[PDB]
């Protein structure tokens, strides 16, 4: 939606390496604000965004309590799945779960999320109606029964529709100037000769937020999609993203190529070219 909050849980059974580990990270759109790792020296909830640090000690103790309990709950979960699939205590296994809520224009819940995966594959997931589940296989059916009896769906619906949206709004308010302001990318084209007949024109987009962006190379107007080498959007390390698009073109003719950049932080799409200097 307009904004979203997500929690990514990773619980891992590591035979020999140690007791079941549990990691949890919190995100508001493309910004991480919290982190918990039941393996660090002091297992506690730590801040990862400046704006979240304004929350008092009560908030932290609250998150830490939940996460510590989650650590134990997930250990059971891992064992249960092990049995479900008739697995041994010899192999490593990982459970992943994503919780989240999308804020609509009206400030209310637009869409809720809750999906789990065992060893990289879908296991169980809450449906769009926030009242029914979808088991991937018969083993997941067991979990579904437990969860239906325990009324987990209703519990989650309450959270997604209420608590999630409520706190998402608080977070958005606290970090207004960073979370609600879209940063446009700094663009520039570079020329890299590969041979006396061809050269690579690389169009850069750095320091933009959020990650969503579209880079395109055009020759006299026609989109050179079929020949554009595009890298996956990558984090700059300072809460911003960077990405580039390159195209191999013949010497001289390069003056016929233009880069088209699209990002929400721009009033209209940019169109730049390589300026020989």
């Amino acid at each position: 939606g307009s904004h979203s909050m997500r929690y990514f849980y990773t619980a891992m059974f590591r035979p020999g390496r140690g007791e079941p580990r549990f990691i949890a990270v919190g995100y508001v759109d493309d910004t991480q604000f919290v982190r918990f790792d039941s393996d660090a020296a002091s297992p506690r909830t730590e801040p990862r965004a400046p704006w979240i640090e304004q929350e008092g000690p009560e908030y932290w103790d609250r998150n830490t309590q939940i996460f510590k309990t989650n650590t134990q709950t997930y250990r059971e979960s891992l064992r249960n799945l092990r049995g479900y699939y008739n697995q041994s205590e010899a192999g490593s296994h990982i459970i992943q779960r994503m919780y989240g809520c999308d804020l609509g224009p009206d400030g209310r819940l637009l869409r809720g999320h809750d999906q789990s995966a065992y060893d990289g594959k879908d296991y169980i997931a809450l449906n769009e109606d926030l009242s029914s589940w979808t088991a991937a296989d018969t083993a997941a059916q067991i979990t579904q029964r437990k969860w239906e009896a325990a009324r987990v769906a209703e519990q989650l619906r309450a959270y997604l529709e209420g608590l999630c949206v409520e706190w998402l709004r608080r977070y958005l308010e606290n970090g207004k100037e960073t979370l609600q302001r879209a940063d446009p990318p700094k663009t520039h084209v570079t020329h890299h000769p590969v041979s006396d007949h061809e050269a690579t024109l690389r169009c850069w987009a750095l320091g933009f937020y959020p990650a969503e962006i579209t880079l395109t190379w055009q020759r006299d107007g026609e989109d050179q999609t079929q020949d554009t080498e595009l890298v996956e959007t990558r984090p700059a390390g300072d809460r911003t993203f960077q990405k580039w698009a390159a195209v191999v073109v013949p010497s001289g003719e390069e003056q016929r190529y233009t880069c088209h950049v699209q990002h929400e932080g721009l009033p209209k799409p940019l169109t730049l070219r390589w300026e020989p200097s």
């Binding site: 939940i66 709950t73 249960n80 459970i95 969860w147 608590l163």
Partner: peptide, 9 residues
């Protein structure tokens, strides 16, 4: 703020 995983898998 996260929910509470009361019920295991």
């Amino acid at each position: 703020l996260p929910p509470l995983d009361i019920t295991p898998y």
